[PDB]
Each structure stands twice: as C-alpha cells, then as structure tokens.
From Swiss-Prot, chain A:
PANTHER family: ATP-DEPENDENT CLP PROTEASE PROTEOLYTIC SUBUNIT
The name this protein goes by in its record: ATP-dependent Clp protease proteolytic subunit 1
Enzyme Commission number(s) from the entry: 3.4.21.92
Subunit-level organization: Fourteen ClpP subunits assemble into 2 heptameric rings which stack back to back to give a disk-like structure with a central cavity, resembling the structure of eukaryotic proteasomes.
GO molecular function terms listed in the Swiss-Prot or TrEMBL record: ATP-dependent peptidase activity; ATPase binding; serine-type endopeptidase activity
Organism, scientific name: Mycobacterium tuberculosis (strain CDC 1551 / Oshkosh)
Function of the protein: Cleaves peptides in various proteins in a process that requires ATP hydrolysis. Has a chymotrypsin-like activity. Plays a major role in the degradation of misfolded proteins.
UniProtKB/Swiss-Prot annotation, chain G:
This protein's name: ATP-dependent Clp protease proteolytic subunit 2
Task performed by this protein: Cleaves peptides in various proteins in a process that requires ATP hydrolysis. Has a chymotrypsin-like activity. Plays a major role in the degradation of misfolded proteins.
UniProt EC number: 3.4.21.92
Chemical reaction(s) catalysed: Hydrolysis of proteins to small peptides in the presence of ATP and magnesium. alpha-casein is the usual test substrate. In the absence of ATP, only oligopeptides shorter than five residues are hydrolyzed (such as succinyl-Leu-Tyr-|-NHMec, and Leu-Tyr-Leu-|-Tyr-Trp, in which cleavage of the -Tyr-|-Leu- and -Tyr-|-Trp bonds also occurs)
UniProtKB/Swiss-Prot annotation, chain H:
Source organism per UniProt: Mycobacterium tuberculosis (strain CDC 1551 / Oshkosh)
Uppermost EC category: hydrolase
Its EC number(s): 3.4.21.92
Main location: cytoplasm
Gene Ontology MF, one: serine-type endopeptidase activity
Protein name: ATP-dependent Clp protease proteolytic subunit 2
Gene, per the UniProt record: clpP2
Amino acid sequence: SLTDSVYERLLSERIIFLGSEVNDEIANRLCAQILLLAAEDASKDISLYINSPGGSISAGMAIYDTMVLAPCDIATYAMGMAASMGEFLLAAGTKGKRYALPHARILMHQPLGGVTGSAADIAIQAEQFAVIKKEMFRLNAEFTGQPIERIEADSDRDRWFTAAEALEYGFVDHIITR
Amino acid sequence: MRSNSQGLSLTDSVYERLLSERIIFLGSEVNDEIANRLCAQILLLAAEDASKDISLYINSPGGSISAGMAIYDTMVLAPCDIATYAMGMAASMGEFLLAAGTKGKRYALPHARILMHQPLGGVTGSAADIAIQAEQFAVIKKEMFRLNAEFTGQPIERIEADSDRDRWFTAAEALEYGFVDHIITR
Amino acid sequence: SLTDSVYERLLSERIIFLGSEVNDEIANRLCAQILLLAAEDASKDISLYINSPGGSISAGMAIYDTMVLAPCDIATYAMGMAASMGEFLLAAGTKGKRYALPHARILMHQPLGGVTGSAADIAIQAEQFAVIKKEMFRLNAEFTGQPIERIEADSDRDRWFTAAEALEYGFVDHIITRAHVNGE
Amino acid sequence: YILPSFIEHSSFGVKESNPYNKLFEERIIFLGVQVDDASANDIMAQLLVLESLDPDRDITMYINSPGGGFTSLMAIYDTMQYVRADIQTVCLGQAASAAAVLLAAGTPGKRMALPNARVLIHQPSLSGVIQGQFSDLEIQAAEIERMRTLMETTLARHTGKDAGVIRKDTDRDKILTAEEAKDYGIIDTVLEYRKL
Amino acid sequence: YILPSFIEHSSFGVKESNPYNKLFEERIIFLGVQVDDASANDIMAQLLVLESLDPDRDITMYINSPGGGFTSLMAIYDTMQYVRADIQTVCLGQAASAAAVLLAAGTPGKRMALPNARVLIHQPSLSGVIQGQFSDLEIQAAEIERMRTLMETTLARHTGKDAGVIRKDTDRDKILTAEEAKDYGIIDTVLEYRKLS
Amino acid sequence: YILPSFIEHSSFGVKESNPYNKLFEERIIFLGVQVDDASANDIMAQLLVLESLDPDRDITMYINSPGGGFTSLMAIYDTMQYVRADIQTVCLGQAASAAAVLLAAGTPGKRMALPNARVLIHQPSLSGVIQGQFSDLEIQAAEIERMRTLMETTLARHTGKDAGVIRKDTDRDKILTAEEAKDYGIIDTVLEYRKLS
Amino acid sequence: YILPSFIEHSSFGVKESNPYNKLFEERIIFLGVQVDDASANDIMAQLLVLESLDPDRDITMYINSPGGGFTSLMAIYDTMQYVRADIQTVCLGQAASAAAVLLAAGTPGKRMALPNARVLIHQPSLSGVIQGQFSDLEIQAAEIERMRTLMETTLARHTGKDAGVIRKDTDRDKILTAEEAKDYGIIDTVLEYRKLSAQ
Amino acid sequence: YILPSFIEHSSFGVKESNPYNKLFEERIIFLGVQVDDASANDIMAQLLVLESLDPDRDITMYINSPGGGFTSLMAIYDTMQYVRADIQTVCLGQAASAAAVLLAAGTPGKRMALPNARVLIHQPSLSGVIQGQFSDLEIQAAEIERMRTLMETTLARHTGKDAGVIRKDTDRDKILTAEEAKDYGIIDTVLEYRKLSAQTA
Amino acid sequence: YILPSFIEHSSFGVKESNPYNKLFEERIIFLGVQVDDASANDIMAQLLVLESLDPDRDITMYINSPGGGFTSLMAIYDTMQYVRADIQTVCLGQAASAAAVLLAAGTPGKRMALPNARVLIHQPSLSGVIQGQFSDLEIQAAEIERMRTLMETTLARHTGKDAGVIRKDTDRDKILTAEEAKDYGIIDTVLEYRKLS
Amino acid sequence: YILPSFIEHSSFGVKESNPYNKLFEERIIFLGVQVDDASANDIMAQLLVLESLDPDRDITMYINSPGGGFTSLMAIYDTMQYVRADIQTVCLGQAASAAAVLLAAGTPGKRMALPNARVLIHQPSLSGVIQGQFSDLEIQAAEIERMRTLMETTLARHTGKDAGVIRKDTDRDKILTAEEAKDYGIIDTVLEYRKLS
C-alpha cells in the first residue's frame, strides 16, 4: 500500500509515527516497532514523531514503558499537536532529545474516564482514579522538572502551550529551526 | 511498482518480523478468533523450535474464558517455555494468561496495571436451562480460582475474596501478590 | 495476510482448524482442505483442532462425510470448547485419535432450528426434525459407544462435560498433558 | 382520519353518537380490523354485553376483515355460539382467514353476504420464524396440527361439509365469490340490493 | 392541523358541531383520504347509519380522493348500491382509482363534478412484491385478474360502455377532465358555479 | 380500535358506558393483555375496588391472555385470594403461562372455560439475556428457582396435584384443551353453550 | 401548543371558544398550513358549511401559507368560485405557490394583503422522483403540462393578464411585494394599518 | 389501556370515577411504576394533598414497584415522614430497590405485605456510564457513597438493624419473602387472606 | 408537561381556566416558543380576535422567545401594527432574532423588559443548505437580501436608528442587556421590581 | 402516568381537581421538571397569574428539579422578584443548577428544605458543541462569561456571600446537604418533620 510503503521506508530510517488517537491497537504497533528497531540496532536512536490528540492512558503507558526499557535513546518530535498522552509521550522522550516544531501546540490536562456500576464498583473505580491521577502527575512533574503541585493545578483543565511556552515549562528541550 | 508483501500490510509485516523472533502479542479482547490465532502461533513456533523460549506480550482487557483456556492449555502443552510480559494492561483473562507464564519468566513492565476479578457472563432461557447455566458457573468459578491460586501461590479463599469485585494491582503489588516474578527496569 | 500465513504454514503441517460457528462458508473451506490434504498425501494423518460453539447441522455433515471418506486418518483435538456440531465432529475423529486438552469443555445437546409457514409446510419441517434428530443421536451413540436412549436423554438439554467426564462418556479417547506430552 | 358524530332528537332527551355506536345501539357489532387478540377481546366484550343488555334479541355481526389470529378466532367463535341470542353474520366486503370461519359460524339461516363480497379460506399460517430446540418445535408443530384440524372440524360442522374435504380445499388459499360461498355452505343467502 | 367548530342557535337549544358533522347532519359523506380498509369501514358505517336514520332521503357523497384499495372498493360499492336511498356523487377535486368507480357508481342522473375536477382511471395495481411458491403466486394472479375484470365489468355497467373498451382504455393510466368524464359516462352533469355574479 | 359506547335508560338518570365498563358494573374484570406490571396493577386496583364497593358479591374474572410476568402473577394471585369476595374465573379462549395459574386460582367450584378454550402451562422463562458477574447471576438463578418452585407449589395447592408432578409436566410447554384442563384440576366446569336453539 | 381559549359574556348565555373558532364564527377561514390533501378538504368543508349556514353573507379567507399540492389547489379554487357567497381573500404574510392563486381567486374588489405581505408564484413542481416505464412517464408528463397550463389559465383569468405572459413570468420563481402584487392584478388593495393612534 | 370507570349512587349526587381515584378517595396512594423523578413528584403531590385535605386520618400507600431513582427516594421518604398523618405501607407484590426502603419507612405498626410479596434490597446502582474528567468523577463517586450510606442509615433507623449490617447484607442483591421481610424488620405484619369462604379456619 | 388549572369564584357563576387563558382573558398573549409558521398563525389569530372582542383596550404581548422564522416575523409584525389597539410589549427573559424586532415593534411608550432580560439581534440566517440551479439560487439570494434589508428598515423605523447603522451592528450577533436595549431604542422602559418589600 | 383526581364537598357546590391543581389553589407552584424554556414559561405564567388573582398573599414554590437552562433561569428569577407577593421556596428533594439559584432567590426568611434535600450548584454548562466561525464563537464565549458572572452575582446577592467566593466554590460541581445549604445561605430553615408521633 502507498501510505504504508512510505511509513515503511521511514521505519527503516528509525523514524516512527504516532499520528492518531492512542488505542490499544496503535500502542501495540508502536511498542512492536520499538522492540523491532531496538533489536535491529541497540546503539542508534529512534525518532518518534507525534501528532496525536491523546487517548487511552493504559495504552499510552505501554508505549512509555517500552520507550524507557529500550536500550537506545528515543527522540521525540512534536509536530502540529501533542495532547494528553500525546504530550506525555513527547515529554517522556530521552532528555535533551525532545523537540518541538515551531507551530506545534501542546496540551496538558488531567485524565478523562467514566464511572459505571454499583456503588461498591464505583468506589473501586474512584480509588483507581486517585492512584492513576497521582502517578500521571508525578511523571509529568519528573519529565518537566515542575513541582507536582503546579502540574496538578495546571492540569485541572485544558492547559495549552505554544512551542515556546512548552520549552520553558520543560516538556521539550529544543525548538527546531530551518 | 516495488516493495509490497514480503509481509502483506505494514502492521502485519512488523508483527511477522517479531513472530520470527519468537515474540507474539495478545493485544485485544480475547475472542475465539484471537485465541485461535495465538494457539496457532504457539503450535507453529513450538514446531519450528521446541527448545527455545516464546515471549508473549500481553496488553489485553480480557475476554472469553473458554477462548482463554484454549490459549492456556496450548501454553501448558507447548514443549518450550513461555515467558509473559505485562505491558500497559493485563486484565481478567489477560491477567490469568500473564500469571500462567512459565514460573520465573513472568514479567511486568513497571507502569503496567493488572486487574483481577471474577468471571462475567449471562443467563438466558427457561428455568431448567438457567439452572444448568448456573451449575456451570459454580464449576468454572471454582476452577478459575483454583488456578489463580496455583499461579500466584495465594490461598484459594483469598483469591475468591479479592476477585469478588475489580481488584487492581500496580506492577509492584502484582509482584508481591504472585502474578508476576519480575519487574523489568534495566 | 499474517493470520492466513500462519494458518497456511500450519496447513502444510497437515493441521487444520475449526475455530468458529460452523456455517456453509466455514464447512466448505474445511472440506476443501481435507480434500486437498488427502490428495497431497493419502497415508499421513490430518490433525483437526476444534474450538467451536457449533453451528449448522447440514454444514457439519458435509465435514463429517468428508472426514469419513478421506483415505487418511483424522485426529481431533478439542481445545477450549467443543459444542454442538463442534462436539459431534470431535467425537467423529478416527477412533483412538480423539484428544481433549485438559481444560477443554464439551457440550452436547439436541438440535436447534426453526419453524415457519403454512400448517402443511410446518408438518413437513417437523417430519424432518424427527429424522434428523434420530440420525444425529444414532451417530453420537455410535461415536461414544453409549446407547441411543441415553444420548437422547442427556441431549435433551445442555449437557456439559469436562475433559475427564468426556473421556468416560466416550467423546474422546485421550487427554493430553505436560510439556513432555501424554494421553489416557 | 375523520368519523363524524351526530345528534338524535327525542322527547326524553338529546343524545350524541357515532356511526359505530348507533350501529351498536342496533345490536350490530362491526368486525373490520385484523383479528389480533386486543380486537378479539373487544368483540367478545361487545357480544357478552349485548347478551346481557337483552338476551332474547338477535345480535348482528358485520364483517369486513382481512383476517386474523387463529388463537383469538376460537374465543370469538365460542362466545358467538355460547350467548343466548341468535347471531346474524353479514359479510360486507371481505371475510378472510378467521373471519371466514366466523361468517360461517353464524346461526343457520342468518348468514349473509353482499353480492360482490369475497370469502377467503386458508389453513393456519405462521409468518415469523419460531426459533427453538427440536423438542419445543415438535410441540409447536403438534399444536399447529391440532389448531389446523380444529379449524377444519368447526368449518365442517357449519358448512355441512366433510372435514377431510375442507382440508383438501384449504390446503392452498381458496377464494369464494358470494355465490360460491353460498354453494359451499358458508352463508345462507346473498343479499339483494334494496334501492328504490 | 386545525378545523374549527362552531355553535348553532335555536329555540330548542344550542349545539356544538364541526364542518364534517354539519355536513353529515345534511346527509353528506366526505370521502377524502386514501381508500384504506379502515376508512372504507367508516364510509360503510356512515352509509348504513344514514339509511337507518332516514331511508327515503338522498345521501350525498363528496369525493376528493387520490385513490385506494380495490379490496375495500367493492365493499363500499356494494353498500352504496344496497341501501334504500339514492346516492348522489360529487367529485370536488380528484376522483382516482377506486374513487373514480365510486363516483361513477352513484345513482344515475346524480353524478357530478366541479368543472376543474379530475378523474383518473387505472387497472388495479400492486406495489409491494408478493413473495411465494409459484402455486401461491398463480392463485394470487388469478385473483388479481378476477379483481381487474370485475372493476371493468362494474364500470361498464355504470358508464354504459362495453367492458372490453374499458379494459383497452384503462390498460394504462387514463385521465379525464370533468367534461371528458361526462362524455365517458362517469358523471351525468358538470356543476356550474353558483356565485351571485 | 373501534369500541363503541352506548347509553343506559333509567328513572334515576341516564349514563354513558363501554362494554368494558358495563362489564365492570357487573363485577366482571377482563384480563386480556399480556400480564405486564402496569396491567397487573390495573387488575389489582379493580379487584380491590370491587371488594370495597361490595364485599359480599362475587367477582368474575374473564380470561383471555397470552401470558405474562411471573413477577406480577403472584401479586394478582395474592390479591385474588385476599379479597373478601369469591372469585369466579372464566377462560374465554386462551389462558397461558401466568394466566393459567390465575384461572386455576379461582375459588373452587367456580373455575370455568368455554369448550374450545386452551390452557397452556410452562415453567418461568426469561427471554432477554441477563448479563453480569457470576455472583450476581447465581443470585438471579436462585431467585428463578424460587419463583419456579413457588409457581408449582401454588398450582399444586389449586389443582390438587402433587408439586413434583406439576414440575415433571411443565418441564416443557404443556397444552390443555378445556376438557383436559378439567381433568387436570385447573377448572371445575366446562361451559356448555346456552343458545336458545 | 399554547392556543388559549376564552369565554364570551352575553344575556342569552355564556360560551367557550378559540381564536380559530371565533374567527370561524365571523365567517373567516384560516389558510395557514401547507395545502396537503387533508387540509384542503378541511378548507372545502369549511367553505361549503359557511355557504350552507348563510348563503348571502361574505366569506373571508385569511392566507398565510408556504404553499401546496397543485392537486388540491383546483378543488379549493372550484369550491371558492362555486359557493353562492362572495369570497374575500386576505394575505397576512405569505401566499406561496397554490396559495398565491387562491389569493388571486378571491372575488374581484375583495383581494387584499397586509403591506409587508409576500406573494410567490411558481410553476408546478414535483420533488420526489416518479419511477416507471417510459409509457407511464409520458402520460405523467402530459398530465403535468395540463396542470401547468391550467394554473396559468386560471391566474390569467383573475389577474387580467395574458396566459402566455404568466407562463414567461412563472418559468422561474417570482416574488411579489404586496404593492407589486397589486400591480400584477393578484390583489385589489393593500391594507392600511388601522391603529387608533392614527389622528 | 383498558381501565374501566364507573359511577357512584348517593343522595347528594352522582359521580364518575376510576379505580385509582376511588382508591385515592380512600386515602390510598398507588405506587406502581418505576420511581422516576416525574412519578415521585406525583407521589409527593398526592401525599401533600391528602395531608392538606385531612391531616388526622391515615394515608395508605400501596406498593408494587420494580424499583427506582435514589435521587427521588429521599424526597418521597422525607415527605412521608414529614406529613402530619400516619403512613400505612402495603406491599402487594413487589417492593424493590427504593420501593423497599419506602415500604420500610411506613409508620411503625403499619407496614405490611401480602404473603407472596417479594422485597428486594440493593445498594444504589448507576447504569449508564457517566463520562468525565477525573475531578468530576471523584465528586460523583463521593456523592454516590454519601447516597449509599444515607440509604443504609435510613433503613437501619426503620428496621432496628445496625447500619454496618445493612451494608453487608445489601452489598449484593438481597431478596426477601414477606415472612423474611418481617423478620428483617421491613414490615410489621404479613396480611392474612380475608376471603369469606376460607373463613372456616 | 404539568400546567395546573383552577377555578374563579363570582356571583355570576363559576369558571374553570389555565394560566394561559387567564392571561388571555387579560388581553395578554404569550410569545414563548420558536416563531415557526404554526405558532405565528396562532399569535395572529389571537391578536385579531382580541381586537375584535374589544378594539379600544390595549393588548399586551409577553415575550420570551429564542427566535424564529423571518417569514412569519413580518406577518405578526403587520398584524401588530394593523390592529386598532395599542400593543404593549414585555420581554420577560429573552427576545431573540425575530422576537427582538417584535419587542421593538410595540407601540411607542409601551415597550418593556424585566432587568435581567436579554435582547439578541442578528441578520437572517438560513441553516439547511438550499440546493439548486444557479438561476434558482440567485433568485433565492435576492430574496434573502430583500428580507435582510426589510428587517433593518423596520428596526430602524422603531428604534429611531439609521438603517445602515442597524446593518453594521447586526452584521454579527448582537446581545443587549435590558439597559443597553433601552439605549438602543428597542424598549422604552426597564421594569422595576414591584415586590411589597 | 397515574395521577388521581378527586372531588371537594362544599355548600357552594362540588368541584373536581388534581393534586397539582389543588396545590395551585393553595398558591403552590410545583417546579419538578428540567427547566427547559417551555416549562419556564409555564412557571412565569403561574407566578404572574397568582399575583393577579391575589397580590397580597404569599406564593409558594415547591422545588424538586434536576436542573435547567440558564437562559430560562433569569426569566423566572426576574419574575419571582418582580411580583408583588412574597415567594416562599421549598426544596423537597433536589434543587440543582438553576433550580438551586431559584431556591436561594426566595424572599428572605422563607427559603426552606426538607432534611434530606440536596442542593447542587454548578457554573453554566453547554453540552452540545456549538460550531462556527471564530468571530461567532468569541461572541458566544463572551455571552457565556456574562451569564456565568451574572449567576454568581445573583447568588452572592441572596446568600450574602462574596461573588468571587461563589466562583471559587462553583468552579466544579458543589453539593450541599440541607444543613450545609443553610450554612451557605441558600435557605433559611430546614423543615422539621411534623408527624403527630
């Protein structure tokens, strides 16, 4: 397929894309690609272009863990839009190798979700929310160097960053130029 | 034009390159369809090389019990060892299969989440029919617990208690509960 | 395709799968595969893995006849679930070469169906039901060694078997075990 | 959608009514929909009430029905037969399926049709597939055969025909002009027009 | 959606009514929907009731109907013919399919239309596929040929035309102006406007 | 649905009613739909009201019902048994599922059917799958077994049959002619036709 | 929904009514929906009844209709012309398609509109595809041409215009202010406001 | 659909009514649908009106309800408790979920059921997923726990049971026969049949 | 869904009414839905009837409308202006689109709003795509420019503003508090609360 | 569905009513649905009518509403404040969103709740995406901010709280028990049960 063929030619250049809603399906393909690339060449960098409005946290943590556990460095490039898990993953890039294209936009906000059943069931879901929320913040604080209190505050509602603002907040290390 | 199917589609091609590395994935709801493909892959791999390990990455919210037992039995009956890796999420049959990995070779990635809970199902027909469905529930429930207890080393009483509703584990907690042997990191 | 490629590699190992609802479509592919394999090598066994909740009787009899008429033996493996036609086909395996994986479940029950039309039409459908029911039982009795009266009784409603119970009832000849493999 | 009402003068007082009510006041029941359970009850209730209001006077049943549930048929039938009063059946247009039997089930001498009326007879159908275990389906089929032979039995009783013959004739759909229906013994007379 | 009601003075008392009811009080039946079974019954009931209320006085039938079930047609037709009273038919706008036959079926001398009325005649249709065994379908087809020839027969009876000619003319849809309908024998007179100017 | 109303003369005054109301005025309750919760309430309300209006006189229940909710069955049943007045049950047509039990639950000596009536008995069904945790399902199933054995218990009480036998006979759908139903003990008498000829 | 009713005092007694009824009591028929067959009947019935209740007195027709079936148009039109009484037409807002013709079809001298009324004229349309054999379609098309030329004929009769001219002008949709509609001969007068804060 | 009406003789005049109205005339409120907000209002209005028409006479509540909104439950409950008059609760068939609490919330001594009645108790459910930011969901969950503990509190108050015990017993669905419900303290008496024929016993 | 009715004592007799009717008895018309054609007719009929019942007394129009068809607007507007009686307009909550013009179109001196009322003005919209040949679309577009300039013209007339200015201000949606609406010349006074404290 | 009516004895005569009407006869308005525009009009009409029927006597508003349109809120609010009579507000179960503000907007000293009542406050939402050009959306957003600050302003006025504090507290959904609501200044008193035992 043409599209695939292009992505493939790129894949052999150690360039992978995260271009949509992060589902299990998309996550798993990504984790596979990293596993694959790391096995081909443990020394050379992997470049991860991100243009994603975010998605499943669980699915995103698969990618994150996979990134972290990879032998090689993982460079992250924010292009167009890096939101929610998109931002997270971007910010999880190996430190010093996190890039933003100049008109990219970063979006940070607290997790979304749902609440379903009996009151007992809901109690449990809620307990998990607390855990997850705590953890996601802890990480974003770690990535960015901001204090967890600020991450929490800022994440409360949609928090938008221009590339410049993102650089100073600590999501990203560099902005690319020309 | 050039460079089509050495492995037909891109996604598939990647999964294929990995399959020849003795790495298989369980990445979705466990249906019959998904189960059968997995059992096939294990059969295939075991036939290629009975000595070498198979690595089974799991990121699944669970699914059909019956279908999951197909995989389990296939795993157990394989000549080679089967290493299990929990990445992102291992829930329900996902957790089960994870915990069924060859002992010592069950891994969790550090921000993976494990979910243990009692089986779900449905109850359909005439009262006679339902009586029978119910009898089966008892049997299955009992058995699924027995196994999880075996896998984890927990007593069946605790497995039953904890399974009553959604029971969530972090990688750390999962390690101490006995679902998993190791946490990767570096 | 990936999935296909795997099933193909396995097909050349004389290993075929019945993994879903038995329709005409699935039945025909299976019958074709057996035909194909029997033509390639009439002496060597065919292994038929079954994980199926059952399905069309008519479609299942195509497979059955095809199995029976094959020159080579046909080994059957119950994995996960063998229900309705699934169980039937499992139990139709060449005698001595019917296997169950240990946590497989077997389900035996009487045929399902439907009735419609004019009273004359329905009379006829019903006559067929009698014939089919009789025949299906006769066969299950033959396969299992149970008397037809028992097959009938037990089949009245959903009748569930564990691998062990299935072995004793006569659906299956052996149960498989451990990494270094077994039987019963 | 519109059915007018009107008013009746008298010395006793002044009353509003419909056509259907005025008809009912004259001991005329109108059978004009599909014989679904709901409407069958409505018919029985009307029959039973008329009998109660005056047991000696005739009840007349106007029929123009495209057909209906065998289940409800026998109820209406029993009720017709059961009540004290004579039942006069009149086919205005069409008396199909169930409605045909009913037409036929009127008290002898009092079964009629308008000249271009049309009677249709057919064995009990069952559109909609009934799904199920064979066991349940054999029971079903048994029930339908009973229902079939009962329809034939009761038609035979009222037409003076042999039940076996009815079965042969109704195997397939059977359509009767008013004249033909008379010959067949479903109605007694064919109404002549009374214009001046 | 809106149809006003009104009130009639008198020394005896004071009564509420509609247009349709007032019309009915004047022995006028309004035939204006599609001739489905339900509405046909309603028409017959009205006819039968009017006859009962006063058998000697004329019943008038106002027609403006885009057409309807052949099944119900013959019922209404029989009823019209059957009742004691004369039937006066008046086409106000359109009398199509079934409604055309009914218009024609009024008592002779008393069939009318307004000048720009429009009569349409056509053989019995059957939209909706009827599925079935050939045997059942041949029976069906037989029935529909009967129904066809009966429509033609009864039109012939009332127009004074030969049935074979009707068949030829109705093979395909046939549209008649009021004048043309008069020539054809479907109506007796074309109503002249009665405005005081 | 055309259900006529009418008027009753008297010296006290002049009243409008339906058939169903007139029936109700004669202490007859009509049970003719599917026994859904709504209609069951309506039945109980009617029973309870009739008892209140006159506790000594009989209440008659006309039955022609294709069946209904086990949940609502026991309520109606308890109410029937509970009220001061005797209950006379009459199967016109069909008494199925729940409606069969009710028919049977009339006061002894007063349970009847028309000759071609048809009684159908069957264990409590549940179409619609109920989804859930096993724990919730075992509870459900328990409840359904209770409900089943209670249906059998109460039928046994009123037919004079052993409960175990009822269970054997209702395992599968069981259809009774009026005569057969009498033998079975569900009704006391089969109504003979009372036509004056 | 919210259409209030009210009560009228008198020495003879006390009566309930609506606006629409009160209007009808004054021999005013309200033509305000789409001219579908159902509503057309309702209009004819009203016309026919009013004539019957009092043949000498005028009937007035209030028009605010976005348009309607040509089939029903001619019926209403015939009925209007046919009844004994004079017909006074009043366009309150809009008189479109069919409704325009009717407005025009009032008795001469008695056709009116409010100042910001809006009359729209257009040849007979047919949305919805009619499927069929060519034979059946040629018959259809013939019928539509008849219907077209009849609409033009009758407008011509009432506006004083030549039918050919009407055809040209209505080829495409044609929109008329109240003033323009008067010039065109569709109405006779344009109603002036009668507010009591006049002089 | 077919709910007959009828007429009552008297010297004062002649009145038309239903069963439901006649029931209401006897200060009987019928609680028979799902306890949705609309119907709850209808119940409160009835209670409030009955109290107003005659504050000293008892109000009877007939219950046959498959269950309902916890939100509306407390409103009805408060209103029941609040009005001057005693409330007599009667379970005719089924009293489930909310309806069970209400049944239990009648004035002591006056809570009843017919013999084959069926009481079902269960913690507050929430079918329908509520979507949202975690923040909004934690608030939601908090609210549901409040609602849960308040249901238990009030059942405890009226059954004489400890709230912790109620919580245990309702963790999962709990079904009570009339007899069992009496033991549980949800009703005071089980109605005996009053048929004039069974009265040789 | 629930709108109570009530009864009024008097020595002459005893009458049932609603709020809306009682309001109407006081010559108050309630304009509260979307100004669709149906409702607009209902408004005109009310106006015309009130004028007829008593031409000298004021008519009051209560406005709380989220907006409506330009087509119907002018009709109501013409009718308002046309009738003999003075029109008093009162914005209770919201007067949007069309409703805003009407509010403004009351007789001068008698246009009011409650303090938190909200007036919204905007040029004529057209959601729904109108498909067609370019010829038909140019005619359409012409019509809609006429309709636009007419809305502006008539607002100008009643606010004392220049039409060109109105056009500028309404190019985009324009929202006015009650105070702002007074300044703009849409209402004359802002109602003060009259609570006895 | 099943809402009984009943009859009231008296020497003057005999009248039929509902609960809702009887409630209305006692100057009680029931606010129990979602505050959509339609129902808001119904409320205002009732308020305005009650004031008219007797301006000196109190009007009482029973509240059990799961919430509603900010648009309609201010109208009802203005009307409440505007009419001559005192308004007594009573929360029976829930007073959410809009309904909470209204509850709070009763005349001081006369705002109440039943003990287990539940008040919920939240800033104005907007489910449903509003599509548009940025220009139109900025205007929209502006309007929503106005609406938000107005809600806060008016709550502040009636609770005695600072507006800025209200804004902090309502940022997210805020739920109050009856007691808590009293402390917050939304109601004055919490109704004690008046059972004679």
